């Protein structure tokens, strides 16, 4: 609601939420460690943290220092993702 259902990178309609930090889990969760994102940007962020050992502090999409990376990853998806594989769930 706060983000007006807009992605924080491409300003597209937002459907997912990315956790900036993991200070609290489950019992307490302020709406300040979360950011609104679309499917492509969330997937790029997920693939940008697989083996970095970030632990607590994760990627903040608002930081410019990540922007040039994130878009690049997005390009790869648009070049290689197959919609017939996400459908027909295996």
């Amino acid at each position: 609601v706060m983000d007006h259902a807009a992605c924080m990178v491409c300003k597209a309609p937002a459907t997912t939420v990315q956790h900036v930090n993991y200070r609290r889990a489950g019992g307490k969760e302020i709406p300040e460690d979360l950011r609104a994102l679309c499917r492509l940007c969330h997937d790029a962020c997920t693939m940008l943290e697989y083996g970095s050992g970030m632990t607590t502090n994760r990627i903040d999409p608002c930081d410019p220092i990540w922007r040039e990376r994130i878009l690049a990853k997005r390009k790869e998806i648009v070049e290689f993702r197959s919609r017939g594989q996400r459908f027909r769930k295996m």
């Binding site: 489950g26 693939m47 940008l48 697989y50 083996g51 790869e76 998806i77 290689f80 993702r81 197959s82 594989q85 996400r86 769930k89 295996m90």
Partner: protein, 165 residues
Amino acid sequence: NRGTVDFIASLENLKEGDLGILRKLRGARLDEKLPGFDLFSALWWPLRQKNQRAPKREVAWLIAKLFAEFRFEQREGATLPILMGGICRKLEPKKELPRVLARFDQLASLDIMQMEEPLSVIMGILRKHQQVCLDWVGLTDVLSFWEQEPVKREWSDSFIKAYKI
């Protein structure tokens, strides 16, 4: 524990093409290739949604690759330190047994990101001796908490108990 049983069941439900896709991704990370990422996400994400104690991404990826390569049959009570340890009773004590034992013991000095090749050679040694069953759920549970001393102690104790029979 629930979360791993369903993961292994879903892995056992895969067909030849997905197994080949995972086979061609051995020795690689989760992010570089997109088909493998999509398949792993489809297999794993609902389980993580429903169950909070689901296995982490790295362990699940490693287990998926190992299952794709080796394709053992799931059976409770057939863990690695028992089959390896029952096999070690048929080798020459002077030469071959220390060579196998060192490879089995090297696992205690590696993290989850470097445990592909040693496990591969161990499972190849298993396959060379006509072994068709393995406990995947138990292996995943051990690998999840590999950074705890009692886990390693129980692992070695099970190996010794199986070997001394």
